[PDB]
Amino acid sequence: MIGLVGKKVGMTRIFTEDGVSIPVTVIEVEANRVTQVKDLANDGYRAIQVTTGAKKANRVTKPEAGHFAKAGVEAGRGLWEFRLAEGEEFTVGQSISVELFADVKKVDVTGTSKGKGFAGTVKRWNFRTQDATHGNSLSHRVPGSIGQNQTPGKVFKGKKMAGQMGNERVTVQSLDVVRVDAERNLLLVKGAVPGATGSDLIVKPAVKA
Amino acid sequence: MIQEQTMLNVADNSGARRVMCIKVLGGSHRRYAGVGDIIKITIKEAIPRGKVKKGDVLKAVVVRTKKGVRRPDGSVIRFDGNACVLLNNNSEQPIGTRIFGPVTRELRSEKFMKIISLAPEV
Amino acid sequence: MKVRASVKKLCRNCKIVKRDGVIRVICSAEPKHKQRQG
Amino acid sequence: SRVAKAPVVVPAGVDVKINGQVITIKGKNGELTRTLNDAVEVKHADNTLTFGPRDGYADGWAQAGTARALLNSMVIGVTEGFTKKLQLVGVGYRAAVKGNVINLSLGFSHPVDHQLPAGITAECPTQTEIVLKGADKQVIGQVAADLRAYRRPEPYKGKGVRYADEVVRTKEAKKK
RNA sequence: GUGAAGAGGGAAACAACCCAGACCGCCAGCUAAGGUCCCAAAGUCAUGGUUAAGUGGGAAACGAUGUGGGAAGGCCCAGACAGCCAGGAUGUUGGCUUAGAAGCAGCCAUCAUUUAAAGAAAGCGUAAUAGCUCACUGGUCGAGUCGGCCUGCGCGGAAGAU
RNA sequence: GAUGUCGGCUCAUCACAUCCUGGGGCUGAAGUAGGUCCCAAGGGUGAUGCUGUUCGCCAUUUAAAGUGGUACGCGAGCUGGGUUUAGAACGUCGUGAGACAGUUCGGUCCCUAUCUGCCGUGGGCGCUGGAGAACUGAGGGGGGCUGCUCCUAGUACGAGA
RNA sequence: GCUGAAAGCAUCUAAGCACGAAACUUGCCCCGAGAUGAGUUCUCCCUGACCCUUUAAGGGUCCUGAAGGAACGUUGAAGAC
């Protein structure tokens, strides 16, 4: 089934009456406004394109403005697409709200993880550090060997090395839905989700269940 | 968190005074043992006329750690030292008959009812 | 199943059959007479 | 070949329909059909069927013999069909038929329910007996094998599902 | 003999292998080794066979109803081979040590004799006869049947590291 | 007109003659267990005492502690205990200088990366008027392990355990 | 394993019909049209002259410059740059 686009508000706890603390992530899910419906005949597949939030009228270009005007909806801060199953249908201009998840109890949350910059092999790939003492020469956190010898004669593609870490799209699967609060546009899921505070989150019903 | 070479105090009247963890058993490459975990130990110090001798190798259950345990609340209970209770190597039952110092709630497992009953507290 | 390079009849009830390019001995009396040539 | 030499006799009430290679038999029990191999000549005659190899086909006689056997089974199929009898041996082993489904209790921790194919009907005289009826010899044999596979007759007491006319040949463990 | 101290064509490439030794020039022809579906020049050539594994296009003792032939045999239409209703007058609990394994403990009587033919046991569990097939050969069915030999080409045997 | 040796370390990749887990046939397989053979590389396959050690033997784990290839994989990645310089001694040998795959103690490991190879990160052009977005999926990669307890069920089995 | 001849029988195989493992291919996740084989949908913007010739998918001149983008600056749970 489709999902909704929200933003990571932060993280807190919920105390249950039987003395259990549930670490929850607070996701603010405003109304998602359908801006385009893609169908098999015209686009080759079935999906809806949604928008959410708001954007400053000076920051929206007339290409984007014209695209929004065709749907007859207000400008949002972006556009996302959701693949449609066989059953459901939607109409352009329709708004979808958080009570979509009223009876779901597992979600998959996708976001852009925090960017770690250029990271070494110890941090990025959990490589073991070498000896801190006992004669070690300038080689406390270096990767060590990277290949065999003349017989391969090259470094194998996909070798684990230092480089960019984080700042990439990550999905976390099968999160408990703790609370759906329609009037506050809030969704509370158990556990941590990728991304820093204030970043966009894509919430979908769990695919594996 | 108890690992190999960790020294432990003895929380029963079996006769041992200091024991050292020989193996955190119950899995491959397993690193630590918390409260309620079973470990294999050697006896480093014992009283002259106890039921166990220095250098004996046998099992034990960890009942107090100064890393502590966490409750579902999120609270934590820490102790001032690490303590264990000696168990028979084959039948994992306590050797001693008195239990010294408080124990914690995690030992209620139908396997350590003797320790819970004999303990002074919790 | 006996896997051998030399498969032969071992009693009167054992029979040679070729199934999918493999010589096999199936025997209705003695289960340990089953053989495939491999 | 010399199996295929003997023609099959078409009795009264059953008819034949031939379209070169695909053949059709209709009788009191129902409908049967198949496409014969490209190397066999089906040839209806006065209330008989005669089979012979084509030309330019090696081993046309073997295919002819196979075709003769299959059509013979069809004719015996659309009249009085075929029957397979299964027995259940072992304490607590029971069978029961519920419409189109056989329920087997063979000592598992879960129920065993077998779905019958289109043309097969089952009937349990006792809980230790499963009688199968149908027109297709191959299908009824397959269903009997599938039922048997759930609990094969083990060689120490013969416990399990067996064909009624089956020999088990048990044995003793070591001694005593 | 060739390289050394030789080119060129071929061998996928590949001093020393094969064909064949290069005076120079030619947008001439004709051949050798090797080829003629395409990469890549020239047979998608004619006529007959033979293999089905990709043999070709990597492997042995050793196995096997895989097929193309040849020369010889036995059996048989009175009826072979097989399938089938096939079982049947054994003194048989006729020699086991002992009071039945008289057979298949181990050895010895190990024979008459039957059915129409059978068993002094050839076995299997059973040391047993118990039970079972039976070499039985009595019927039925009606054209082939059962082995070896010699050769042609295939099959398995047949596990390696970027 | 020089291709650094062993062991450890850090990092590996592949083969299958598969150690574990998975499928199956035969048993001299009642169950619990096995044995033996066949298929199968998806993942996983100990950390310590002694020794420079690979190994070995221990003492405890584990689901299991696979076996090989890779310049006995890896020193322009690291160490340098061993071996293999120059000092010294011992046992032995030689008249001696000296020797000894016998022993012992101590004993300078340089390399600012051009190219390929790899991990990251960008430009230029093309994409056929330009632009803002949003897409698709043709291919690539990653993950892909297992214990214990309980119920079924002291049921099946055994004769009882 | 089922039906089934060759090779009256039989026979998992020859025709034909079923199954069957952490392998395989998917399914879970990521990248991805330089996928030069460079794809797709929606939206935005430009519809003035003149001259010279080799003439051709030609070149200038004047007026015009749009969508958009860049630059610069305040900056960032982005980032060696």
Write a brief structural summary:
Chain A has 209 residues and is mainly beta. Chain A has three helices and twelve strands; from the N terminus they run βββαβαββββαββββ. The interface between A and B is small, with 4 and 3 residues.
Structural notes for this entry:
Chain C: This is Large ribosomal subunit protein bL36. Chain C: GO terms for molecular function: structural constituent of ribosome. Chain C: Keywords: Ribonucleoprotein, Ribosomal protein. This is part of a larger assembly, with chains A (209 residues), B (122 residues), C (38 residues) and D (176 residues). Chain B is mainly β. Chain B contains 1 helix and 7 strands. In chain B, the strands form 2 sheets. Chain B has a 5-stranded mixed beta barrel. In chain B, strand 5 and strand 6 (76-77) form a beta hairpin. The two termini of chain B are 20 Å apart. The relative contact order of chain B is 0.23. Chain C contains no helices and 4 strands. Chain C has strands at residues 2-4, 14-19, 22-27, 35-37. Chain C starts with a strand and ends with a strand. Chain D has 176 residues and is an alpha+beta fold. Chain D is built from 2 helices and 13 strands; from the N terminus they run E-E-E-E-E-E-H-E-E-E-E-E-E-H-E. Chain D has helices at residues 60-78, 137-149; strands at 8-9, 15-19, 22-26, 31-35, 40-44, 48-53, 82-89, 94-98, 101-105, 112-115, 121-123, 129-134, 160-163. In chain D, the strands form 4 sheets. A 4-stranded antiparallel sheet of chain D has the order 11-12-7-13, with helices on one face. In chain D, strands 1-6-5 form a 3-stranded antiparallel sheet, covered by helices on one side. A 3-stranded antiparallel sheet of chain D has the order 2-3-4, covered by helices on one side. The chains are: A mainly beta (209), B mainly beta (122), C mainly beta (38), D alpha+beta (176). The interface between A and B is small, with 4 and 3 residues. The structure holds 3 RNA strands.
What are the SSEs and their pairings?
This is part of a larger assembly, with chains A (209 residues), B (122 residues), C (38 residues) and D (176 residues).
Chain A: E1 4-16, E2 20-28, E3 32-38, H1 40-43, E4 47-51, H2 62-71, E5 80-83, E6 95-96, E7 106-112, E8 117-119, H3 121-125, E9 163-165, E10 169-181, E11 186-190, E12 200-205
Antiparallel strand pairs in A: 1-2, 1-12, 2-11, 3-4, 3-6, 4-5, 7-10, 7-12, 8-9, 10-11
Chain C: E1 2-4, E2 14-19, E3 22-27, E4 35-37
Chain D: E1 8-9, E2 15-19, E3 22-26, E4 31-35, E5 40-44, E6 48-53, H1 60-78, E7 82-89, E8 94-98, E9 101-105, E10 112-115, E11 121-123, E12 129-134, H2 137-149, E13 160-163
Antiparallel strand pairs in D: 1-6, 2-3, 3-4, 5-6, 7-12, 7-13, 8-9, 9-10, 11-12
Chain A binds three RNA strands through strand 3, helix 2, strand 9 and strand 10.
